[PDB]
């Protein structure tokens, strides 16, 4: 149909899944020279760490992180993840994940974390979904490569294990997202085909997203 990133996943659904399941473990050299959560909130107008431009300048309640996109990279296709932890443990969770989030090997060029001092405690992005990781197709024609999907899945699974290994308590996953039982913190939604309001109907549609299935099955 019109071709698009998702059309490609649908038509190469099994090829991608099979290629991914044959690849060797991904390795991410974690960064050490990174800010802690307090440092992140001090980003203000502008800060830099491992190539990620940081800012906590205002408008919204988040601290943003963005590394320059490769010329070979495609256009955002809606795929993204949230990370939900106990509200009280966001600073510790951030620190635990910093080495991966700022990694020169990370597949995620853009992400954001809630500034807990800018939101009310009972807020949707306060009780959970305190991190948002944006994914985009890695190939010039806006298609996902098997290599990149495997790397992304490996990365999200590393985030999961790091938080669990740190014994971080889980948060309240947003109604908008879906996640399998083995993801205790991560959740997913595609912003091109879903909104922020929950509903089993939207979760149902999301569960059928080829990208989500490739990330979980």
């Amino acid at each position: 149909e019109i071709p698009s990133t998702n059309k490609h996943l649908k038509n190469n659904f099994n090829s991608l899944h099979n290629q991914m399941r044959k690849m060797p473990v991904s390795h991410f050299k974690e960064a050490l020279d990174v800010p802690d959560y307090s440092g992140m909130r001090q980003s203000g107008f502008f800060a830099m760490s491992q190539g990620f431009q940081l800012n906590n300048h205002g408008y919204d309640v988040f601290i943003h992180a963005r590394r320059e996109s490769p010329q070979s990279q495609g256009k955002f296709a809606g795929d993204k993840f949230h990370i939900s932890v106990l509200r009280d443990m966001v600073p510790q969770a951030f620190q635990a994940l910093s080495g991966l989030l700022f990694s020169e090997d990370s597949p995620v060029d853009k992400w954001a974390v809630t500034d807990m001092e800018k939101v009310v405690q009972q807020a949707r992005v306060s009780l959970g979904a305190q991190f948002t990781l944006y994914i985009k197709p890695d190939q010039e024609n806006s298609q996902y490569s098997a290599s990149f999907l495997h790397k992304t899945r490996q990365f999200i699974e590393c985030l999961e294990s790091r938080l669990s290994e740190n014994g971080v308590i889980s948060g309240q996953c947003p109604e908008s997202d879906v996640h399998p039982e083995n993801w205790k913190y991560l959740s997913y939604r595609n912003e091109l085909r879903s909104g922020r309001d929950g509903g089993e109907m939207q979760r149902q549609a999301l569960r059928e997203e080829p990208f989500y299935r490739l990330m979980t099955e």
């Binding site: 807020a123 979904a129 944006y134 912003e191």
Partner: peptide
Amino acid sequence: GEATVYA
């Protein structure tokens, strides 16, 4: 102000 959107 609390929107997790990409833009």
